[PDB]
Point group: C2
Amino acid sequence: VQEIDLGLTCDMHVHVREGAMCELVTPKIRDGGVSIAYIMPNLQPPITTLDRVIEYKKTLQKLAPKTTFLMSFYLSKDLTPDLIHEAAQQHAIRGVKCYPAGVTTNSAAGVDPNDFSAFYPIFKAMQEENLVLNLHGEKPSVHDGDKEPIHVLNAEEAFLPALKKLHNDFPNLKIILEHCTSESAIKTIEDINKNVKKATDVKVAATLTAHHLFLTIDDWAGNPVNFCKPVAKLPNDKKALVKAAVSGKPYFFFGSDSAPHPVQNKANYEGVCAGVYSQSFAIPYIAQVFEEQNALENLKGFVSDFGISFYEVKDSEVASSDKAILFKKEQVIPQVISDGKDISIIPFKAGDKLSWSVRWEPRL
Amino acid sequence: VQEIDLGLTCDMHVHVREGAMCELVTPKIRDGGVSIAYIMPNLQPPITTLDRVIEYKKTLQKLAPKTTFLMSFYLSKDLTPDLIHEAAQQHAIRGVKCYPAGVTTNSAAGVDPNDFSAFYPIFKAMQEENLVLNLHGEKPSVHDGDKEPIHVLNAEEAFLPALKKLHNDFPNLKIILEHCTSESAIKTIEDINKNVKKATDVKVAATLTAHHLFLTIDDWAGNPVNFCKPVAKLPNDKKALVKAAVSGKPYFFFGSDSAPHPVQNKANYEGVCAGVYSQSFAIPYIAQVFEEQNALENLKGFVSDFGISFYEVKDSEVASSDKAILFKKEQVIPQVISDGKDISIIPFKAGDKLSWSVRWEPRL
Ligand SMILES: [Zn+2]
Ligand SMILES: [Zn+2]
Ligand SMILES: [Zn+2]
Ligand SMILES: [Zn+2]
């Protein structure tokens, strides 16, 4: 069609930073077609305390009163089981996000995924509170010269056993392999979900971004704006990801990993910041894929039903009941997204035109 | 300190550009320890005419009177067998370089390597004139069907059947697979040379760069300064390249593919120029590798003997008979190479220490 009622859309992987960047980006969650956002915690310093996560949400709600914000802790050395219980009962967090140390933006305070044991008391506490464990599933790189090298291309596959071990050791814990990028990872998620049918059985899920449904290594090799973690991989991988996205299966749903960086932090000869900014046109990006796959009927599941179901989002939490209406009027993605002061963002697929727009409708 | 007499060193794959950039880099051939340079032709517009290649070489000779320059044409529809014969008879070129269109800097308007048939009159003339056919051996990327998709990691392997067919159809043509980056290509080169005894029988050879002896995908994921074509690939590829370089086989020799770009052309958020600048310390970079492999006794063959033998460089051509002497004095690579005007280049391994330096000694 033209005009599709997507209802209460979900983006379960959002970065909105702080300060002026946050003031620019947080209103764009709504503008991009997203009602519900799961907010990642890799701030400087990481979000590891109750007061910080409460005030952060306050800041976000003031900037965007109609957006529903689900918050998270950064899996940290500082964290204790005791704070996990406290934060959960105050409904101050919906999950804890794990960054392996050094693999991505603001991950230097993260963990070694070879030895998760020191966080098992944290994971047991999360398991009891029905909290979500989000994993940036990549092992840190190892060249070494004795055991198998780990690099940006196999670091996701090399993480898959750690995922299984965590799932085995905490079988009631809801776990997400965030932003999956490889056929290997799809197969592992498919397998873990062998005989779960109809949604409520899913304990381990994976989010898929907009940009990994378009990008391959060829697109970021010479183009830092398309460089993100985990890196876009081979055509065979993008094929597995697109097939999963339009599949209608409840263990794949949308998480943009929209990651804003000022343009000066992309135009570096070294230390290019990882991340693709997709917030401003999130749902229109995804619609393009589903149109091309002749599967617009599975769109509402991928960007709404499955994320709501897995995170158990209740209508009583929702900051606005407005529905996201996808309507097929052309727009051109600007070359830059700016606050008119010092922040310029290069948006994903800058300069390209999209077939779809999104507007907001009240429920009556 | 310890000293190694390398004789008349050869760098059979050099980019020196034009204008002020050329004035900066051309004297660095000498400074990096290289006596003989094979000059690539991908200028804007490419070198496809006799008068242009005559003038260019004179310009280089003016900038560096002690450096021996071997020149090339860019493989183009513009070329004719009559121009090949004329250019060779005037000793104006030693070879012709083929760029597949779109695969690297100033490579479109290059050729299609699902073809090469349209250039067979050129290859016949080259074969008759004892000219070398240099190949940037990567197939242009293809993601859509039918065929197995082509991307930056398999594009070299995907080129190897074009190499075999050319060698089959022109068994007396000297062909070089420039800057090999994959284990597959190394093996293909060895297999092609299965029945070769004595260096002079080699018809198909490969050059190896300095930087592909150090780099893997992780070194350029996020660091445009290490981004070049063909892209540095996996640890297994790096190991195979290092083994070939120290192998003592006459069909592998040094070609830096030193590719200078002003730093602002590397610090781009899109369209990063491909290329690593190694001219300023060319031979010391290689020495570091040969030392680490305990193969210094093979250094001279790789950077001198085998290139001279393959290109048949005669003492009567050599612009200076000074010998390159390696001496084991430690040095630090500067942060930038600059002309003190408008050009700064970030050199390969900027800031690192090298065990060896280079000096020049007169013969007799
Ligand atoms: Zn991540
Ligand atoms: Zn993220
Ligand atoms: Zn090349
Ligand atoms: Zn080159």
